[PDB]
Amino acid sequence: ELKIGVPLRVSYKEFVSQIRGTENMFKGFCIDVFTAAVNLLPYAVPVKFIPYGNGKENPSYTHMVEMITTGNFDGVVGDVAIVTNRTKIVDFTQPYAASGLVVVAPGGTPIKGIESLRERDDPIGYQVGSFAESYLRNELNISESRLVPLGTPEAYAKALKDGPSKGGVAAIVDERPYVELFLSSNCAYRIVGQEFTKSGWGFAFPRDSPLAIDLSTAILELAENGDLQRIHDKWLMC
Numbered sequence: 538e539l540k541i542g543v544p545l546r547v548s549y550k551e552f553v554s555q556i557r558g559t560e561n562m563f564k565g566f567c568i569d570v571f572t573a574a575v576n577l578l579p580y581a582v583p584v585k586f587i588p589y590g591n592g593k594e595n596p597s598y599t600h601m602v603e604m605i606t607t608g609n610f611d612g613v614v615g616d617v618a619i620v621t622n623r624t625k626i627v628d629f630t631q632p633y634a635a636s637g638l639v640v641v642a643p644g645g646t647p648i649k650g651i652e653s654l655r656e657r658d659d660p661i662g663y664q665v666g667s668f669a670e671s672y673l674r675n676e677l678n679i680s681e682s683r684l685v686p687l688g689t690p691e692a693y694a695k696a697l698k699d700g701p702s703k704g705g706v707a708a709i710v711d712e713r714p715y716v717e718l719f720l721s722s723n724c725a726y727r728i729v730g731q732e733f734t735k736s737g738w739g740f741a742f743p744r745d746s747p748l749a750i751d752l753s754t755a756i757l758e759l760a761e762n763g764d765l766q767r768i769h770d771k772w773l774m775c
């Protein structure tokens with residue numbers, strides 16, 4: 538059986554969540570996609586889903602993927618963004634889900650988008666465990682003093698409501714999929730400006746894994762048939 542790392546998510550469980558009363562039993566969009574894709578392969582793939590994370594906060598997804606390079610995981614299934622530092626250590630599938638960063642802010646915010654958020658003095662929120670932190674630092678040179686990690690949609694909402702004046706944020710940078718789920722439950726907030734990154738979600742396997750190439754064909758089969766959108770819509774639908 539393959540040891541498949543799964544992120545032990547504390548928020549936005551629609552993507553992946555551990556089943557109550559179990560360590561190794563998971564449900565969600567990412568798990569349905571995987572299950573769908575494996576069923577199109579010419580060979581059996583017996584798995585053990587191993588939770589990665591402390592159960593209190595969403596894990597570092599980069600660190601989850603690194604456990605492939607150490608041989609602790611045979612691969613990783615979840616909402617894993619196919620970003621460059623990750624692609625240098627493991628082999629991702631074709632993307633099964635479109636993603637990328639947006640700016641989330643209050644209705645009347647003076648922020649026009651990422652460029653305006655940039656030159657500001659104020660805190661920016663990001664999601665616990667996300668690449669979004671290194672992107673803000675490496676790509677936009679935002680001071681670490683300004684970057685606030687936020688673990689839950691409830692923490693997102695409190696931080697935006699409070700604002701910089703009360704130990705909150707002026708805005709949150711997070712990938713569109715989580716943000717759509719957030720705004721669905723928190724209709725006071727908006728995306729400001731354009732999606733300014735475009736990395737999708739992939740399944741991660743060891744470099745030169747045949748399973749990453751076989752699963753890519755299977756994912757292209759799900760997308761071409763409309764099933765990928767069907768799976769997306771059954772888990773994700775102001």
Ligand SMILES: N[C@@H](CCC(=O)O)C(=O)O
Pocket residue numbers: 595596598599616617618664665666667668669712
């Ligand atoms: N999809 C995010 C992880 C989200 C989270 O922080 O839980 C990533 O690939 O980095």
Ligand code: NA
Pocket residue numbers: 563564565566568569
């Ligand atoms: Na499921």
Ligand code: NA
Pocket residue numbers: 580
């Ligand atoms: Na094989």
